[PDB]
Scaffold this active site. Sequence first.
Site, short mmCIF file in Angstrom:
data_model
loop_
_atom_site.label_atom_id
_atom_site.label_comp_id
_atom_site.label_asym_id
_atom_site.label_seq_id
_atom_site.Cartn_x
_atom_site.Cartn_y
_atom_site.Cartn_z
N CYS A 44 0.84 -1.19 0.00
CA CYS A 44 0.00 0.00 0.00
C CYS A 44 0.88 1.25 0.00
O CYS A 44 2.11 1.15 0.06
CB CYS A 44 -0.96 -0.01 1.20
SG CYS A 44 -0.38 0.74 2.72
N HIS A 45 0.26 2.42 -0.08
CA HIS A 45 1.02 3.66 -0.12
C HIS A 45 1.92 3.90 1.08
O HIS A 45 2.83 4.72 1.02
CB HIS A 45 0.09 4.86 -0.32
CG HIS A 45 -0.31 5.08 -1.74
ND1 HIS A 45 -1.42 4.50 -2.31
CD2 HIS A 45 0.27 5.81 -2.73
CE1 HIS A 45 -1.51 4.86 -3.58
NE2 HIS A 45 -0.49 5.65 -3.85
N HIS A 66 3.90 -4.47 5.59
CA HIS A 66 3.19 -4.45 6.87
C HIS A 66 1.80 -5.09 6.78
O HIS A 66 1.02 -5.03 7.73
CB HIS A 66 3.05 -3.00 7.35
CG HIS A 66 2.33 -2.12 6.38
ND1 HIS A 66 2.87 -1.78 5.16
CD2 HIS A 66 1.09 -1.58 6.42
CE1 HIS A 66 1.99 -1.07 4.48
NE2 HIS A 66 0.90 -0.94 5.22
N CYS A 96 0.76 -5.72 24.24
CA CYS A 96 1.45 -6.43 25.32
C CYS A 96 0.45 -6.81 26.41
O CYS A 96 0.66 -7.77 27.17
CB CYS A 96 2.57 -5.55 25.91
SG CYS A 96 2.02 -4.23 27.05
N1 LIG Z 1 -4.83 5.74 10.77
C1 LIG Z 1 -4.34 4.59 10.31
O1 LIG Z 1 -4.15 3.69 11.15
C2 LIG Z 1 -4.11 4.38 8.99
C3 LIG Z 1 -3.87 3.12 8.55
C4 LIG Z 1 -3.64 2.84 7.26
C5 LIG Z 1 -3.66 3.93 6.39
N2 LIG Z 1 -3.89 5.16 6.83
C6 LIG Z 1 -3.93 6.29 5.89
O2 LIG Z 1 -5.17 6.24 5.22
C7 LIG Z 1 -5.07 7.02 4.02
C8 LIG Z 1 -5.68 6.25 2.85
O3 LIG Z 1 -5.10 4.91 2.67
P1 LIG Z 1 -5.37 4.20 1.27
O4 LIG Z 1 -4.69 2.90 1.21
O5 LIG Z 1 -6.84 4.08 1.06
O6 LIG Z 1 -4.69 5.21 0.19
P2 LIG Z 1 -5.15 5.47 -1.31
O7 LIG Z 1 -4.14 6.31 -1.99
O8 LIG Z 1 -5.33 4.21 -2.06
O9 LIG Z 1 -6.53 6.21 -1.23
C9 LIG Z 1 -6.50 7.67 -1.24
C10 LIG Z 1 -7.68 8.11 -2.09
O10 LIG Z 1 -7.92 9.50 -1.84
C11 LIG Z 1 -8.19 10.07 -3.09
N3 LIG Z 1 -7.88 11.47 -3.04
C12 LIG Z 1 -6.65 12.10 -3.15
N4 LIG Z 1 -6.76 13.48 -3.03
C13 LIG Z 1 -8.12 13.67 -2.86
C14 LIG Z 1 -8.81 14.85 -2.67
N5 LIG Z 1 -8.23 16.07 -2.67
N6 LIG Z 1 -10.19 14.77 -2.49
C15 LIG Z 1 -10.83 13.53 -2.50
N7 LIG Z 1 -10.13 12.33 -2.69
C16 LIG Z 1 -8.77 12.48 -2.86
C17 LIG Z 1 -7.17 9.33 -3.97
O11 LIG Z 1 -7.51 9.55 -5.35
C18 LIG Z 1 -7.41 7.85 -3.59
O12 LIG Z 1 -8.61 7.38 -4.20
C19 LIG Z 1 -3.57 7.28 3.76
O13 LIG Z 1 -3.23 8.57 4.29
C20 LIG Z 1 -2.99 6.18 4.68
O14 LIG Z 1 -1.66 6.54 5.07
C21 LIG Z 1 -4.11 5.40 8.12
ZN LIG Z 2 0.85 -2.62 25.76
ZN LIG Z 3 -1.12 -0.85 4.27
#
Ligand SMILES: NC(=O)c1ccc[n+]([C@@H]2O[C@H](COP(=O)([O-])OP(=O)(O)OC[C@H]3O[C@@H](n4cnc5c(N)ncnc54)[C@H](O)[C@@H]3O)[C@@H](O)[C@H]2O)c1
Ligand SMILES: [Zn+2]
Ligand SMILES: [Zn+2]
Lengths: 373, 373
Positions: A44-45, A66, A96
């Site tokens: 993933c990204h 991951h 843990c």
């Molecule tokens: N909090 C967490 O635990 C956690 C866990 C995993 C991922 N994340 C985060 O979640 C986010 C998304 O993950 P993903 O795998 O789906 O990524 P992804 O790139 O596949 O999905 C992002 C989407 O947002 C769209 N997008 C981009 N700019 C936009 C805008 N201005 N307006 C509307 N849509 C827009 C993109 O075109 C894409 O469809 C990332 O920032 C990732 O790091 C957080």
């Molecule tokens: Zn712990």
């Molecule tokens: Zn991931």
Amino acid sequence: ANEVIKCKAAVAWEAGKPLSIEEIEVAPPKAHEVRIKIIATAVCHTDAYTLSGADPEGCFPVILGHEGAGIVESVGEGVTKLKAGDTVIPLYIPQCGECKFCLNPKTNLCQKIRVTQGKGLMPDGTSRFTCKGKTILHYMGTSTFSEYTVVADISVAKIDPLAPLDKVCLLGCGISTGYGAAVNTAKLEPGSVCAVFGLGGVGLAVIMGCKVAGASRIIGVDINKDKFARAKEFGATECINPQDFSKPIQEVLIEMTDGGVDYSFECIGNVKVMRAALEACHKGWGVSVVVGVAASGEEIATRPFQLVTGRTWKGTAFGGWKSVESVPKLVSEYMSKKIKVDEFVTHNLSFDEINKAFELMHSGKSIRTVVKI
Amino acid sequence: ANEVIKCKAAVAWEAGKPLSIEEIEVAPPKAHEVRIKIIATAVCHTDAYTLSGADPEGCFPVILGHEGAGIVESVGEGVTKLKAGDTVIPLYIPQCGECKFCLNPKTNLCQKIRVTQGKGLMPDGTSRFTCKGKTILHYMGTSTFSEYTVVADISVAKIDPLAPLDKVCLLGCGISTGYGAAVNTAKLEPGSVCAVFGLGGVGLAVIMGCKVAGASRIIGVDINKDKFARAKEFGATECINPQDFSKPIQEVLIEMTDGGVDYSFECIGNVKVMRAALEACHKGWGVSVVVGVAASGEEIATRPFQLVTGRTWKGTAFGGWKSVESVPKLVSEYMSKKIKVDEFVTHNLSFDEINKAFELMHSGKSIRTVVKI
Ligand SMILES: NC(=O)c1ccc[n+]([C@@H]2O[C@H](COP(=O)([O-])OP(=O)(O)OC[C@H]3O[C@@H](n4cnc5c(N)ncnc54)[C@H](O)[C@@H]3O)[C@@H](O)[C@H]2O)c1
Ligand SMILES: [Zn+2]
Ligand SMILES: [Zn+2]
Ligand SMILES: NC(=O)c1ccc[n+]([C@@H]2O[C@H](COP(=O)([O-])OP(=O)(O)OC[C@H]3O[C@@H](n4cnc5c(N)ncnc54)[C@H](O)[C@@H]3O)[C@@H](O)[C@H]2O)c1
Ligand SMILES: [K+]
Ligand SMILES: [K+]
Ligand SMILES: [Zn+2]
Ligand SMILES: [Zn+2]
């Protein structure tokens, strides 16, 4: 005894470069460590961001990955809960079960091994990976881009032996996060009006969660209309592209819902959209959850008036799931057909072709690509 | 019938000028309006803000005041819940009990008469005040700086006939707000660790609320150490002056609480402190409530990381109390000694001396000054 394992792994020798298929050495598990045979890993990204080297705390050489699922190959000293043959999923968020975070029901942010993990090392302060005479760092406590990896024994979820590993590996990241954002962090009530910014794997998981919670209206938002079809299959009542309107997206949403949504989720990592998501929430009770991970240094903003008039700003990490105890239950919900996983898989590749996963992401055509080890 | 009343009122002819005690005319109540004889009124930072000329939505000439207590002098057509002689408190946050907000248990922001009220007019679009041939505007739907005022019938709380008005008038704003911020917005659990930024009437009420909720630690924060003594009387376990430390106040708080507070309340209206208050909250479950009203245009900010790792940002208006049904209960809590009111009164003045309340306010030597009409 547990001998050193010689296997294949996708090594990132340096930032901004493609991963290298190398033959590496994987040391046996030390006390409270588990060596896992990775059967499948997704990309993933998150991996791509670290790979780009844009991550200030990202170091090389390192074995990324991951989102994995595999089988316990062997356990180190003192490990009694896990044994060779157990079906498992490595977790970047450990549990843990003894620290103040694990003991507090309101969080899942175990801090037991955060420091060492952040440095790409096991709890004892060293790495189990070597290649061409060089030490190779671990990543997110999992390093799933290897035929064999070693993780802390508290970073392991034992799951249903019948679970398809080329599928549940996705529960190690995106699906669990988005789903939990809806049911654990937001805890939206039946009938709720929702808006989901970003329709990737995370956004789709949120929609899935909103649907499970009985949301009445789920508005998907993405600048890439190709994401809409799948979003509706997941439950979005409608999708809108910010690019099709001249007014700020929050104004459009406020107008479409006569005041704003009850819950909004930012699943992109864009601070300007995060603000929009908050302001798109209805006055008096609107709640916005930040799921996306913004670039370091960037910050979110708004006028306090927004909060004073009732809106709440929240965030989530891995959907708020206490990892070790929750992931197995999530696997069971998938097995029972309560939640979806298969629908997240857009592409499949072999290990040697792992680099193609990155091209797929830069093409905007993927949700989650699954790489077979 | 109900005649025009000729009485005295503190008129604000223009911004940046002191109030003028003038002879005014108060028209009789029209349909669904109530004319109240004001017995006591307090002054607070909100009034001064409008008076200064900084309020972008402040117009003149106007009769300010929103913290009062009095007796119903007469009611207009269609009014049956209230009658001449009833003991009451004017409400700037009404409760029509019919709109979308009133019907929703999560908010108290009735919107029934917001438009007209913001224009300093009764629901029918006109003012009941005149002076020297000029129309004088209403303020916050209450205009308590007058011997007699006219309010919408939904802007009235009927209270205990035995309540001392020169006291409960304070429940019209500061006390109720701070108290509610703790028990309604935060809903802190017993044993919670709290931090309160700003030790004025609002901050003191928050402390009072934290104590009622059974907080284990209540840390008061103010750059004016003269506020400490009274804060401790209200329940603050300790008080700190940000000026006594070289590092950011949030770091100081994190250090003294091993991670941060469970709940923090910003009762100043300073966007920088609002941020510090949020960041002073414990990772994973910390919650910060913005109670202070920042100058228009100002914005709050932080890194999304703070929310993603478990902190929540909230706000509150009038402590989240549905005004009409809550204020009477708050008066009863005071009468039964569950909460304090008398302790908030630091000075007393006659109507002709009303301007001295503003001076006391700006000198920093007051919590709340009560003006006897
Ligand atoms: N909090 C967490 O635990 C956690 C866990 C995993 C991922 N994340 C985060 O979640 C986010 C998304 O993950 P993903 O795998 O789906 O990524 P992804 O790139 O596949 O999905 C992002 C989407 O947002 C769209 N997008 C981009 N700019 C936009 C805008 N201005 N307006 C509307 N849509 C827009 C993109 O075109 C894409 O469809 C990332 O920032 C990732 O790091 C957080
Ligand atoms: Zn712990
Ligand atoms: Zn991931
Ligand atoms: N949300 C609401 O519904 C609502 C209702 C009433 C009042 N308010 C707002 O509450 C806020 C406080 O009201 P108040 O009557 O108690 O005001 P106050 O001025 O009497 O108290 C403010 C206190 O903050 C202290 N302070 C100022 N700068 C500080 C700093 N940098 N760090 C720590 N302390 C600092 C001052 O010394 C003073 O003791 C104001 O912004 C008011 O407009 C909000
Ligand atoms: K909820
Ligand atoms: K709570
Ligand atoms: Zn006030
Ligand atoms: Zn209403």
